[PDB]
Amino acid sequence: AEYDLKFGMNAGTSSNEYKAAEMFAKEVKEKSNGKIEISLYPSSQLGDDRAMLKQLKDGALDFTFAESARFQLFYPEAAVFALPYVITNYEVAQKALHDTAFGKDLIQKMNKELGLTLLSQAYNGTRQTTSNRAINGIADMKGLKLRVPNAATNLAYAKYVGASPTPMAFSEVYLALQTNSVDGQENPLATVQAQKFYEVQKYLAITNHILNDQLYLVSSETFADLPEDLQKVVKKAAQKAAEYHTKLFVDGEKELVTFFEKQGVTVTHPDLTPFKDAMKPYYAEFVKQTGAKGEEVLKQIQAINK
Known part of the structure; x- marks a missing residue:
């Protein structure tokens, strides 16, 4: 196992998030011919989200989950994502993050200032x-x-x-x-x-x-240290996981x-x-x-x- 990587989250082992991250870890293992193994650390074993974001920055922890709205901790205007009744649905959450000036800038600062690389975005339920x-x-x-x-x-x-x-x-x-x-x-x-x-x-x-999303995040340090073909594996697996992640919540919410x-x-x-x-x-x-x-x-x- 050439890269032994770690993914921490708040959610527990029976959550949708955990299932999605299991798919992510399985996908990366398979599609990288066992070069990358991803261990999961659920239920805030490695700290709360503030601590886990900080560890991504220093390259001590490779992956984590976070809501777009959580970045209000660092950039107040990001509260906009979780202002009750503003973001009416998931298409909007996607466009707000990806297709606005504000969103594009936030992604840039996540990298430049916080050492985080955004791989993908998933729906994580309405509250x-x-x-x-x-x-x-x-x-x-x-x-x-x-x-x-x-x-x-x-x-x-x-x-x-x-x-x-x-x-x-x-x-x-x-x-x-x-x-x-x-x-x-x-x-x-x-x-x-x-x-x-x-x-x-x-x-x-x-x-x-309030509508929740979940960002699949990787440490910029870790990701930069991966050869380009492994970068593509991780990126594609993250996209595949996020589609699954979204589907679990959408399906769940009709039942x-x-x-x-x-x-x-x-x-x-x-x-x-x-x-x-x-x-x-x-x-x-x-x-x-x-x-x-x-x-x-x-x-x-x-x-x-x-």
Whole structure:
């Protein structure tokens, strides 16, 4: 095994992400005639996403996953990708990243400033809201102790809809929900199934608040050290994996509501125009932070129609 490479992620071994990364590792092994072996490190074994991105930069870790919106950590205007109700569907997420000036520049900085090479982009579900109480309208969110990842855009979803955002480490969520220490969480359906949150949540609400993508990233150092024929193998396998990755989420999202209802969950479809209207003040805050340039970027993305 001439290159022994490592891929870390947050997702666990029963996730779609993990299955996609298994395909990626298998594909690369086969198509490189065993010259490259890729070991998987799931469930944040090697650190959280901030730590894993940092390791790609220094060439200590070869591959990882990250959402486009996560780069708000470094470039505030990238929050645009996860501003609730802005990015209406996956075609838009693709164009926002690949076909806008803002997106093209972000990819450049990912490489120049952060040591990251983008190989491919995948759909990673629309986020929904689970609870121990029915959400039939925005009114029912008032006071709801809603677990969120520590990421400004998810915090803002919770805050501006009138809930009490409770940031919490993913590992601990199952137990919090079970004990009703917290009333709910928000994640794509696939993650609800993977973490079995349906065992400990009686209600599912179709809030459609935020669309997730996943970027297949490689350390620029590692990738530059590969001979050009192996670069092509990795690049092509990443594209193939991302198509599979996308398909898992799309297929999952025509089934999973039925699956949950089979398991005892009650599913609501609250009116989302009050939810959208509650975000207007958050869009204002985004602009107040990112200035004329952020306003320009938000307009450009809202202008994208499929």
